[PDB]
Amino acid sequence: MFDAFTKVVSQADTRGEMLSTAQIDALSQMVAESNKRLDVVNRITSNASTIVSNAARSLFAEQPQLIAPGGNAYTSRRMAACLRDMEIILRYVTYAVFAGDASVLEDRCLNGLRETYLALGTPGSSVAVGVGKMKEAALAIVNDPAGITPGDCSALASEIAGYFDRAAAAVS
């Protein structure tokens, strides 16, 4: 896995060259906004169980066939597994946010996911909807102005939204 720094170091090594000041300057901007990045990780993580459960409850209310006898989410074992999938995805999104790079998410989570669900019979489109619901909830939490130094996090918020979208498209 790469973090924001090593990702650029790696592409530079393939050209066999040192980083250009322009490349370093981009890393500096990221270092300047790191406090906002850590706040977003802390806020999402601190509301993990809520984001997941509320998203899960909404999914099933909208798509009741998922939990009706015969549905992929019917029976305790499958429900538990479904809930676990939601939690895993959210966990990996927070990893990418913290590292500043999507590799860990793509590499250790989304890789082969679409195929996995196809083989299982798990509606991937339903997973995407669930991921979308978590995204909306997470972003609202990240953008709450209460108990935090006022400032702009729209950039970070846009990056966070990107990871949530990579996930949803990967199982769509």
Binding site: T6, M18, V31
Partner: protein, 162 residues
């Protein structure tokens, strides 16, 4: 790659845990340090040539036989001097990568792992390289945390070669 951000995520992942205050503190430490590391990488980059060319001359002075003896592993000719400068350039470049990443990771993966097999196979003496690293340590002209972090990577390579 051994870097603060990468290791923090790795341990957490291996524990199947969400990130917590422990890992957020690792990030704080990396970002505090990045300020000097990034500037230090810029400095070294601007004086690369002078540093490389000077580290080489320093090696040739301590081991004058490396410019007189006949053989492919030596630099008595132009091919050899060029190879030598290239190798030192590689060492300096890996050091800057480490300042940028905030850890020995880039060096470990691109240079350290396997260096033993290489030196033995081509009959290259670790002593030659250690002398070049010593020269860069005393001539980079860095100060503060930038100097301290930079020297830690130079000394790390030296320790790997002895």
């Amino acid at each position: 790659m051994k870097t603060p951000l990468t290791e923090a995520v790795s341990v957490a992942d291996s524990q199947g845990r969400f990130l917590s205050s422990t890992e957020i503190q690792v990030a704080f430490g990396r970002f505090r340090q990045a300020k000097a590391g990034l500037e230090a990488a810029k400095a070294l980059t601007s004086k690369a040539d002078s540093l490389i060319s000077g580290a080489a001359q320093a090696v040739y002075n301590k081991f004058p036989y490396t410019t007189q003896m006949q053989g492919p592993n030596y630099a008595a000719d132009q091919r050899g001097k060029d190879k030598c400068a290239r190798d030192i350039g590689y060492y300096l470049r890996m050091v800057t990568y480490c300042l940028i990443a905030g850890g020995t990771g880039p060096m470990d993966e691109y240079l350290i792992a396997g260096i033993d097999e290489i030196n033995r196979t081509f009959e290259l003496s670790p002593s030659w390289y250690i002398e070049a690293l010593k020269y860069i340590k005393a001539n980079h002209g860095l100060s503060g945390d930038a100097a301290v972090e930079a020297n830690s990577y130079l000394d790390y390579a030296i320790n790997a070669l002895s």
